[PDB]
């Protein structure tokens, strides 16, 4: 069934599962034509497929060429997402294939289900959680590899850097979603908070700065404060 606040700890057990987020698969800019009509221009996109327990991210870069001469692109995007997730599962050795795939948007269930027909014992689940993975393109290194790509490309990352050497996956996921929530609600402020201090650098093989334990505490509070301020602003509360 659906994933929600109640059954949230199941993400951190030892059953392999992946989140799939398709929000950044089909991305456009909207502009005016010479005759004054509106047209879209596609930019490169990505499927965000994440193992929440281990932090392994499978970033499938979606090159604009895949849309060429295609109609109803927003619907195609869902089927291309499911095709690429299915191919990823097939490329994994049996003992690495997920037992569940959790789609962040319900429109992905039917396309993925149809593409996973060969894996009847992989459950495709929706979620009631309002997860911030669309903000993945606010992470500089991810946006960079997506925009520079010249062809379809899969890029692997650990989205938790090395956090798991010191904290649990539950805590890692909570940190990730807090950072991404902040980045989604006010990217400029979120990014200011992360980089304000030039003495805290990002390792070449990492996505986030090398904060000490205590610095992560100050960060996480600053992200929290950011999120609540934006809430009062949005709703005049």
């Amino acid at each position: 069934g659906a994933m929600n606040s109640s059954n949230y700890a199941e993400l951190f057990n030892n059953d392999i599962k992946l989140f799939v987020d398709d929000t950044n698969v089909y991305r456009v800019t909207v502009h005016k034509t010479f005759e004054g009509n509106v047209a879209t221009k596609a930019i490169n996109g990505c499927i965000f497929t994440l193992n929440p327990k281990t932090g392994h991210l499978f970033l499938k870069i979606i090159h604009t060429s895949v849309w060429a001469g295609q109609k109803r692109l927003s619907q195609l995007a869902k089927w291309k997402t499911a095709e690429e997730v299915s191919a990823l599962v097939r490329s994994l050795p049996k003992e690495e294939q997920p037992k569940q795939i959790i789609v962040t948007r319900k429109a992905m269930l039917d396309p993925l289900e149809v593409h996973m027909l060969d894996f009847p014992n992989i459950a495709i689940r929706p979620t009631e959680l309002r997860l911030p993975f669309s903000a993945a393109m606010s992470i500089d290194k991810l946006s960079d590899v997506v925009m520079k790509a010249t062809e379809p490309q899969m890029v692997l990352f650990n989205i938790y850097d090395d956090w798991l050497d010191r904290i649990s996956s539950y805590t890692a996921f909570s940190r990730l979603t807090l950072l991404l929530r902040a980045l989604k609600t006010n990217e400029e402020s979120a990014k200011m908070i992360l980089l304000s201090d030039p003495t805290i650098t990002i390792k070449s093989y990492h996505l986030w700065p090398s904060f000490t334990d205590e610095q992560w505490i100050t960060i996480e509070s600053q992200m929290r404060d950011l999120i609540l301020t934006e809430y009062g602003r949005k709703y005049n509360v």
């Binding site: 195609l76 089927w79 499911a82 095709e83 039917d110 396309p111 289900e113 149809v114 593409h115 027909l117 060969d118």
Partner: protein
């Protein structure tokens, strides 16, 4: 014109023959139904006055033999049976007619309703859906489940409808995942029509049989089967032109004949709105669409 005699009527029951029906009282001298039109299948069905649960009945065809009804006080229901002794049977039927204890199948001459509801229904195919090959007629009731229902218990008592499943390998060619799921023409024409049913008439026959079982017995898996077979056609971009025009006629008489008070459980909102308004064939069911709007605009 043929006759189905009844040995007796010991328990108060509502008896149906095709779309008609009569109230019969406990031990009322009732001895059968005459002037039943030869040339079509028929269904005689029952609802006891004491148990408005389990409607039940028998599909038959008089060309296939001489059939009669007899109440069984052990099993507590009216049973269809075959009389093999042709003379003993003409004998019973003539005496009951002489005594005028039989009702007349009440067909108005202008009316093609029963023909329109059963146009493609053939006894031989019914007997493959309701497998009990020691009888020439077929029992169905409210509670019988389908073979597909059973997959998601007793198979002797199953409705062996053809399994249709839109998210199955049968329905989706590897490599045409998106194409085949959005345009089911492949599944309809190659898998189902050419592959399993052989022709459109067998397909329509199962569709009509499913509807009649849902109407007459409230059989829920039949209603599921009827909607699925409609949805498969409507969800196919490429359908023979004769099938579409015939489908419009088939559905029109089904909707025409449905009891108004049952539209809520017998008609699946999603399928109908999709078929009439979203599907490839939205524009191909003019008569079915017009009667649906003028009679059940709530469901839409």
């Amino acid at each position: 014109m043929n006759t189905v005699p009844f040995t007796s009527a010991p328990i108060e029951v509502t008896i149906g023959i095709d779309q008609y029906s009569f109230n019969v009282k406990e031990n009322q001298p009732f001895h059968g139904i005459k002037d039943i039109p030869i040339g079509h299948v028929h269904v005689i069905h029952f609802q006891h006055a004491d148990n408005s649960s389990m409607r039940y009945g028998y599909w038959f065809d008089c060309r296939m033999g001489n059939f009669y009804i007899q109440y069984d006080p052990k099993d507590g229901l009216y049973k269809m049976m075959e009389e093999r002794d042709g003379a003993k049977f003409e004998n019973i039927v003539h005496n009951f007619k002489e005594r005028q204890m039989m009702v007349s199948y009440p067909k108005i001459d202008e009316d093609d309703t029963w023909y329109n509801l059963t146009e493609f229904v053939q006894m031989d195919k019914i007997r493959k859906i309701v497998r009990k090959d020691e009888n020439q007629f077929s029992y169905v009731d409210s509670s019988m489940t389908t073979v597909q229902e059973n997959e998601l218990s007793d198979p002797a008592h199953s409705l062996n409808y053809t399994v249709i499943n839109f998210k199955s390998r049968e329905a989706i060619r590897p490599g045409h995942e998106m194409e085949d799921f959005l345009d089911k023409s492949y599944y309809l024409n190659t898998v189902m029509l050419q592959g399993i049913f052989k022709n459109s008439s067998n397909y329509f026959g199962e569709l009509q049989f499913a509807f009649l079982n849902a109407m007459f017995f409230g059989n829920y898996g039949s209603s599921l089967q009827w909607h699925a077979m409609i949805e498969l056609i409507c969800s196919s971009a490429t359908v023979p032109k004769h099938m579409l025009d015939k489908l419009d006629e088939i559905l029109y008489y089904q909707i025409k004949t449905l009891p108004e008070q049952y539209s809520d459980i017998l008609l699946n909102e999603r399928v109908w709105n999709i078929c009439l308004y979203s599907s490839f064939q939205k524009n191909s069911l003019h008569n079915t669409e017009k009667i649906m709007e003028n009679k059940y605009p709530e469901l839409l």
